[model samples]
Target: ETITVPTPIKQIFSDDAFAETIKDNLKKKSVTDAVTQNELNSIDQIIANNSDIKSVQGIQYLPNVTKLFLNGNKLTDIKPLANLKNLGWLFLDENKVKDLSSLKDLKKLKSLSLEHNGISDINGLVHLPQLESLYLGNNKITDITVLSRLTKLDTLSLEDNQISDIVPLAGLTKLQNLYLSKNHISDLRALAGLKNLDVLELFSQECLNKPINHQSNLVVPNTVKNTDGSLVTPEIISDDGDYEKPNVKWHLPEFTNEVSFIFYQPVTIGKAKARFHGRVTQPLKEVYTVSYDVDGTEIKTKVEAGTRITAPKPPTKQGYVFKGWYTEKNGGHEWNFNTDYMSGNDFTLYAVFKAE
Candidate 1:
């Protein structure tokens, strides 16, 4: 007895760009030649992003594909990918694919990137239990009740969705990182169940250092260098991604840490009970002026504390004898330059001159 066997069918791609991508991956230049199943099975990884892939019509032949990237394409429906059950990592970011029904059967899918896709209804994801990382950002998903069943998920990104109530995620204790901001969620009491949580942040505000129209500005201005002084060129204004300052908060911290300040009316201000051990600050040295009354010619010198005054040159009066410096003109108390000292207020010395 003899058995009849069916002939093998060749893999033929429908989309021109998708066909070219497969042909290039298989190193085949023939336009009419067909691709065998053996060559198709050999391909377990393919990165066809930004390759003008409109449809994945011929992808059914790649049943062994473990990792696939079809992001940044014009793909609206990925129905052909349903056959690849071995697919573990799939990136479908930046596409028009709304329906995820084709991905429900991929039990081996671990990390699925669905960001920047207008996919709304994610109810199809309920069947995928092995998914560890799921990126569902930028969608219209209102309810997340289906996510509770995917207990194996470690990282889940549901930002930019309509997720109002997060109570469904309370049962997902294995979740380590969850991105669920920009939704209608006002209460986060359900997040307490995630014991292994390491980081959780809102998808709403960026590191925006500006007030409006600044979603991309994550710049953290640093202490502007005094390059104009030192030969070392001051570093350019630090626009690094430092969240320490944003607008006024940015400048104030720098001011508090990097600025030099001088206190005014320091004595009265200090007198209001300011400094303890060292006096609020040192007084301005308490300068006192020493004036010389040289026949109404007032000449002055300043002294810090009690400083001895030196005998200045005698003033010239035509036909008169210059007398020595005196403390008083009538009392005859002469001023001794060596021993005389100036004090708190201005000190005046009289210059007595008589007719020759």
Candidate 2:
């Protein structure tokens, strides 16, 4: 007659008790790499004596076991896995592994959960080329530079990290699902050209209330170098001759709330030449359309997000300096206008001028 044990029966048989059933029990030889009796006993003693150190935080090495629960384990070193090449999964949360460069050579590692570890830099992950999923939710990593290289990554959870810059993720073409909540990102400019991005959860309240401008639809006058050998000058011509300035100063309300003031004027009946360039922190998300007020008729330009509009340069017809503020999504917004797309919130923009 065979007796069956309940599925929920969980028990650890000691050496003496197992000896009684030795004849019927199958011999279980511990692998050499597996934790020894002395190590397990020592771990038990340490946890029992300290009381403060929890069970999950005591042991240093677990070679044979693939799934190690070291979360909330005050762990300081991940070097024990140096020899555990078979280690496919690891959990080392709430520890003090600052320099994870040791895990660099773990090529076979697939899943890693280091949520509360003190991981500020992500350069160490370059070694784990086989890593498919990463969970680094609670750490201090602001830049997304490390993420750009991982082309195979499908899932990335960076919820509580001190990340403010998301421009590095534009190159991660393989990322299908991304979780970036509770971050300080104010704009989605860096994510402009991510053609594969399907799921996005960027919970920065800065997405709403973006500035709007319509400049493409209108026909703005072009300012080209006058080759007619005539020296151009801002002559104090009587208003009766050239375009006359209205004696009654026209007061206009602040067009752009994000920007303090912008300088632009009507060139054609429905066109305009912006004296100041408008900038947005996240140029990809912020919508812009050009509008004009010529004589009495008003016109609106094409609504757009991207277009290579030239910034105010020194008038080609030398002898005059272009001065005035156009508009910006963020005040004192300085950015490197490399092409038209590289504009952002903080940085010095190149001065495009020809002072004569």
Candidate 3:
């Protein structure tokens, strides 16, 4: 009853060790010793982050998989993921992806992380109607017209890019946390319309020199001074502006929805020596480990929580019929793959057999 996983599916794990890890773990799960290509298609999620994966061509077969993590890999082309219509959450951070037009059809995508990549144009994102949170920071992007159509966005980060204009961002009124630090923006007029914004970052940019005409009652301090009381000049403003630090301040009522200003003090070193430092934490993701015990052999694998653990093929015996997996080896409770949650720490399951 064991169906081996296809060679192509096994090859996508970067190297032999990773491939073996997956294969062995599947066997441990009670998935047949030989995992078939069709079996691979049943997968709903994968957590292959930091796996050094190069080619994603083999991932095309997993049509039903809704979530995939390929962060910290060597990938440049993601054309294989174009057909995954059910894909919801995808993480491709720290890769070499340049073209993203292939992902325009994934309307179900709710969250996407492509930070630290080589993407410059984002026209491919206009079609994702369900996209709520997007991370495109630390890239080489300039224009943001494509994001105007994604009005559902509640959290967005475009920090550390080549973006100078902000007119296109006026449409994202639903945004709560916006990061625009370390960019070339000289104007804050485009952001005046986003009244729902709760947190914003604009350190070391050209726009800090002038008072932002915020009509929405949001107060952002225009002056930046160091802790030592020295005026810090933003480095981008002048070459000699030196050694200026920052003190971030925010105004929020203890129990009311009323909001106020959140800003950093700008330092003027004559030539410009002020520095701005900022960081944004990405949305949280839950991952779990599933270890298997195929008879006496043990193999482990990682998966996201809430996904079903498909029962592998039943084991063989000369005079006995294979029963099902249990929590323990002898007289333990039966393990239900259909309704159980993979939320425990490094859990394991054991197979049981009844004699005929």
Please list the residue runs of candidate 1 whose C-alpha ends up more than 4 Å from where it truly belongs after superposition.
Answer: 1-11, 30-33, 203-356
Question: Weakest 10 consecutive residues, lDDT, candidate 2?
Answer: 267-276
Instruction: Give the poorly placed runs of model 3, Cα more than 4 Å off.
Output: 1-33, 206-356
Residue by residue across 47-149, what tens digits does model 3's lDDT show? Answer: 7777766776556656787988878988888888898989999999999988888888888899999999978988888788679999999999998988888
Q: Write the per-residue lDDT of candidate 1 for residues 247-339, one digit (tens) a residue.
A: 112233211112111111111110121110110111123456768887667898776546666678888889988877776655558777787
Q: In terms of lDDT, which candidate is stronger, 1 or 2? A: 1
> Clashing residue pairs, candidate 2?
213-288, 213-289, 214-289, 214-290, 215-289, 215-290, 217-302, 262-326
User: Against the unseen true structure, what C-alpha lDDT does each candidate score?
Assistant: 0.64, 0.45, 0.65
Sort the predicted structures by TM-score, highest score first.
3, 1, 2
- Residue 162 error, candidate 1, Å: 2.0
Which of 2 and 3 is ahead in lDDT? 3
lDDT, residue 92, candidate 2: 70
